[PDB]
Amino acid sequence: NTIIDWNSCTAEQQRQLLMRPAISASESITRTVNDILDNVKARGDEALREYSAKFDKTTVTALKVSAEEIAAASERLSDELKQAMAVAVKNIETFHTAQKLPPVDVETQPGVRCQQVTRPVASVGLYIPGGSAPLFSTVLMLATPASIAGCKKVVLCSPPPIADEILYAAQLCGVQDVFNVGGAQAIAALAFGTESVPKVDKIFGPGNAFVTEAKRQVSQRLDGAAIDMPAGPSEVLVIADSGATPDFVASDLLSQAEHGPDSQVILLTPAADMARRVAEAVERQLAELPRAETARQALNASRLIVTKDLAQCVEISNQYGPEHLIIQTRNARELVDSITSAGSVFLGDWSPESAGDYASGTNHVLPTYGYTATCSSLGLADFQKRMTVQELSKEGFSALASTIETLAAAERLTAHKNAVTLRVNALKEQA
Amino acid sequence: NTIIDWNSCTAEQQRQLLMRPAISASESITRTVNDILDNVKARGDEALREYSAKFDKTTVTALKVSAEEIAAASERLSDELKQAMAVAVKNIETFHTAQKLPPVDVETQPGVRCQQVTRPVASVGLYIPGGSAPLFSTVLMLATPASIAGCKKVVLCSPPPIADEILYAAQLCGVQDVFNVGGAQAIAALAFGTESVPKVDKIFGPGNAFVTEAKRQVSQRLDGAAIDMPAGPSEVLVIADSGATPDFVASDLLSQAEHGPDSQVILLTPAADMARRVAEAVERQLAELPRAETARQALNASRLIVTKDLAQCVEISNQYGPEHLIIQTRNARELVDSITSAGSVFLGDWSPESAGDYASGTNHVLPTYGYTATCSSLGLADFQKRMTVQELSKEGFSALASTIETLAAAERLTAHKNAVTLRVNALKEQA
Ligand SMILES: NCCc1c[nH]cn1
Numbered sequence: 117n118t119i120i121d122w123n124s125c126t127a128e129q130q131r132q133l134l135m136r137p138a139i140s141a142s143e144s145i146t147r148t149v150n151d152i153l154d155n156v157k158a159r160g161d162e163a164l165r166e167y168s169a170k171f172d173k174t175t176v177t178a179l180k181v182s183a184e185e186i187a188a189a190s191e192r193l194s195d196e197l198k199q200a201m202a203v204a205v206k207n208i209e210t211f212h213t214a215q216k217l218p219p220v221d222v223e224t225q226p227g228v229r230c231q232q233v234t235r236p237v238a239s240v241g242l243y244i245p246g247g248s249a250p251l252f253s254t255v256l257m258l259a260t261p262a263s264i265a266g267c268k269k270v271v272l273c274s275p276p277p278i279a280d281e282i283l284y285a286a287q288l289c290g291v292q293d294v295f296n297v298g299g300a301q302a303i304a305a306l307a308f309g310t311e312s313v314p315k316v317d318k319i320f321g322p323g324n325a326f327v328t329e330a331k332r333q334v335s336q337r338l339d340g341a342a343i344d345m346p347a348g349p350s351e352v353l354v355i356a357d358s359g360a361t362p363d364f365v366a367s368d369l370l371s372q373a374e375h376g377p378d379s380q381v382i383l384l385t386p387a388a389d390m391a392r393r394v395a396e397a398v399e400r401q402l403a404e405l406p407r408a409e410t411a412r413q414a415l416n417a418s419r420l421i422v423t424k425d426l427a428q429c430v431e432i433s434n435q436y437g438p439e440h441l442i443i444q445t446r447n448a449r450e451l452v453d454s455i456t457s458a459g460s461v462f463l464g465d466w467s468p469e470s471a472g473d474y475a476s477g478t479n480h481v482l483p484t485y486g487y488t489a490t491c492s493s494l495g496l497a498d499f500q501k502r503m504t505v506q507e508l509s510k511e512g513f514s515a516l517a518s519t520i521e522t523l524a525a526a527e528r529l530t531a532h533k534n535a536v537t538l539r540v541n542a543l544k545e546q547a
Numbered sequence: 548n549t550i551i552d553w554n555s556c557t558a559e560q561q562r563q564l565l566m567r568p569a570i571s572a573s574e575s576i577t578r579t580v581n582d583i584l585d586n587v588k589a590r591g592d593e594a595l596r597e598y599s600a601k602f603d604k605t606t607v608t609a610l611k612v613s614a615e616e617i618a619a620a621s622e623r624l625s626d627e628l629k630q631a632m633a634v635a636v637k638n639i640e641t642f643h644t645a646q647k648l649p650p651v652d653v654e655t656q657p658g659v660r661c662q663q664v665t666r667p668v669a670s671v672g673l674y675i676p677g678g679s680a681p682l683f684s685t686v687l688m689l690a691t692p693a694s695i696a697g698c699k700k701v702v703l704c705s706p707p708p709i710a711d712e713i714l715y716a717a718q719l720c721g722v723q724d725v726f727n728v729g730g731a732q733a734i735a736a737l738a739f740g741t742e743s744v745p746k747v748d749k750i751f752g753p754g755n756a757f758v759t760e761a762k763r764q765v766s767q768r769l770d771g772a773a774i775d776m777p778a779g780p781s782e783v784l785v786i787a788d789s790g791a792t793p794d795f796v797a798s799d800l801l802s803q804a805e806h807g808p809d810s811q812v813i814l815l816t817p818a819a820d821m822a823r824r825v826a827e828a829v830e831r832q833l834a835e836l837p838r839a840e841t842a843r844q845a846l847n848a849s850r851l852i853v854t855k856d857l858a859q860c861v862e863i864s865n866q867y868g869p870e871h872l873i874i875q876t877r878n879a880r881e882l883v884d885s886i887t888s889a890g891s892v893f894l895g896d897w898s899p900e901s902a903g904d905y906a907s908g909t910n911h912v913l914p915t916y917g918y919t920a921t922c923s924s925l926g927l928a929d930f931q932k933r934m935t936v937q938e939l940s941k942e943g944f945s946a947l948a949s950t951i952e953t954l955a956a957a958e959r960l961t962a963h964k965n966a967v968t969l970r971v972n973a974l975k976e977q978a
């Protein structure tokens with residue numbers, strides 16, 4: 117509970133109110149993940165099978181899940197679920213396909229043709245945390261854009277035994293191979309490759325501390341691979357005016373809170389009345405949540421802030437740059453233009469966070485922990501790259517030659533200048 | 548050396564040729580850079596003047612270059628040079644402006660509106676190495692896309708004294724502030740901010756080993772900033788058939804070679820006679836280069852490979868993924884489609900590397916050292932952020948509610964499910 121009267125706080129107390137958790141990061145895990153990587157790179161599968169004893173009694177046999185196993189899993193899933201996933205995929209597919217960069221083809225000057233084309237990332241590996249109730253929805257979020265971009269190889273790793281939901285999810289999005297491996301060793305297998313797991317160009321998907329560390333390390337190693345983005349605690353910031361519904365606001369704060377004890381939960385409202393009613397609704401709803409220890413633990417760091425007006429809410433939100441920004445105001449749409457920093461925005465009272473997590477079609481893999489400053493939500497662009505192309509006709513080149521020689525000359529790049537002179541002389545002789 | 552017959556090499560040798568040299572780490576430079584960064588964050592300008600004091604004979608006083616000094620440097624440059632930069636900027640501007648993303652606004656289904664909007668990175672800092680032969684053109688390549696993106700603040704740091712060309716290039720592209728600082732201190736200054744230098748969100752521009760390490764470190768620190776891309780030796784790969792002009796091929800190889808003793812220059816040709824002629828052309832042209840010790844050393848690691856046919860040329864290039872791909876073949880454009888990985892491609896006899904470096908309009912800040920596998924040429928997108936926005940109407944939310952609950956329930960995220968139920972019930976009540 118405890119409401120915060122923003123304008124009664126000192127300037128320092130304020131910045132302190134929104135400060136994100138400090139990064140502990142123990143060397144313990146840095147060295148541990150270091151052993152794991154080196155070991156996986158050198159002794160491939162043999163190393164993997166070994167770790168397949170240490171953590172979780174899996175004693176993995178064949179690293180790759182068979183087509184029969186996937187089929188057996190797909191049969192045990194209800195039609196309701198299967199149909200639910202087809203809806204999500206269809207919408208996610210529609211949104212990402214819409215992100216395709218239209219071809220760039222222009223002549224900056226007559227005869228000087230410059231283009232920007234797209235090429236897909238050759239191969240991508242998808243990591244999915246295991247457990248009893250895995251977040252299989254992330255499979256749809258990673259594998260669908262990978263499919264749309266035209267990635268030649270799309271593979272997925274997850275701690276064995278892999279739940280039926282993940283198997284079916286992978287299959288539905290066309291994942292080629294699913295491997296029984298997890299933790300820091302699954303990341304290494306993807307970055308370095310083994311006798312069974314292929315080396316990929318980019319690794320996608322969040323996970324625990326070890327997985328996060330492993331991704332960080334393989335992203336800084338020449339022998340490793342690139343990653344989708346750095347990690348950080350998830351965040352949600354709700355802006356609510358006097359017209360908002362306390363229960364709706366609370367349900368979104370709680371949705372975020374139930375993700376992990378480290379979740380950042382923030383409410384901004386110009387009405388003390390609203391802040392108080394939201395705190396009450398949070399209390400009531402919390403009491404009905406089953407496994408609600410993390411939600412309560414996350415709420416210990418929450419902030420229910422009362423601002424002087426709506427503009428101040430936007431001002432605070434922009435400084436923070438939240439992963440998820442939910443605008444439950446009466447003219448939500450109009451505020452979008454003034455929002456300069458957020459991962460994903462949800463407008464109105466009928467756009468719950470959960471809608472974006474599962475079926476609106478947007479991607480729920482977003483930048484957080486302040487990275488909204490320069491990084492973007494996962495989209496088509498993260499599974500491809502922009503390649504430029506240029507062709508100068510004899511005319512275009514001749515028209516630019518002098519400019520190029522002058523510049524190359526000012527930078528003291530003789531060979532750069534000579535490449536031009538040689539060509540101009542060749543043309544003079546053929547003219 | 549002379550020439551390499553690809554198909555005469557063993558499978559093992561062929562795999563070694565495609566690999567690039569390994570960097571290092573030097574705990575000494577990492578530690579040095581670490582102390583520099585911390586010292587700059589803790590003691591600002593005073594700390595910067597202590598460094599300037601030891602590295603130069605004239606300790607810097609005012610860190611910000613005056614508008615007065617900028618006008619003076621501008622008057623000292625020739626009209627020829629100034630006009631040339633204007634041509635470059637104009638073409639660079641035209642190409643990057645054409646990269647503006649069209650609106651992404653779609654209804655995955657009735658009442659479920661999903662958009663992708665862009666927002667500029669608020670502040671960016673550009674670094675430019677100093678010295679005798681300053682590559683001022685990089686200023687045009689960095690400041691131009693920044694201006695187009697709409698970045699609110701653009702500042703530049705360069706080791707004093709700062710050449711007139713840089714100052715002019717900066718003014719020309721609207722760079723707001725220029726600061727007399729270089730090396731790892733400038734990066735630290737931009738990443739942390741000091742009394743004079745503003746803290747920026749992202750840092751652009753390559754530099755020496757200390758700059759590189761400084762950029763790696765600030766990109767990893769939470770109190771740091773993002774960077775454009777990791778560095779590595781520069782490269783060029785030329786594919787040439789029997790119709791290519793030896794001297795043209797050679798001049799491009801030399802253009803790249805003169806960029807640094809670590810440059811990688813490669814030739815892939817189906818004709819053994821072409822390889823020999825190019826090798827001789829390279830030696831003859833090298834003899835005329837004023838100071839080509841750099842070019843000379845770089846050529847020691849060059850590779851002039853004779854292949855079976857162009858198909859094999861493309862296959863090898865794609866596995867390598869060169870920073871610059873130059874195609875001097877009869878059917879140049881026809882091959883582009885087959886090119887799956889390259890930073891920037893040049894087509895035909897009249898598209899010298901030099902043309903792209905200075906005036907075609909494409910960006911010459913490109914991914915190298917194999918980063919072409921997932922990284923793109925610098926472009927408008929690097930000075931922006933993609934933000935997702937969604938709004939479901941009551942109808943849209945109502946039609947998608949069962950799907951969300953089903954998926955939420957499947958992931959055992961009760962609060963996520965409850966956020967839907969509450970809304971559904973509120974709508975029944977209403978009507
Ligand atoms: N941050 C992950 C979003 C998610 C997955 N499932 C539900 N919510």
Ligand SMILES: NCCc1c[nH]cn1
Nearest residue numbers: 527682684781904911
């Ligand atoms: N790789 C830097 C491109 C350049 C600068 N000037 C000429 N060439």
Ligand SMILES: [Zn+2]
Nearest residue numbers: 371470473963
């Ligand atoms: Zn969620």
Ligand SMILES: [Zn+2]
Nearest residue numbers: 532802806904
């Ligand atoms: Zn060059």
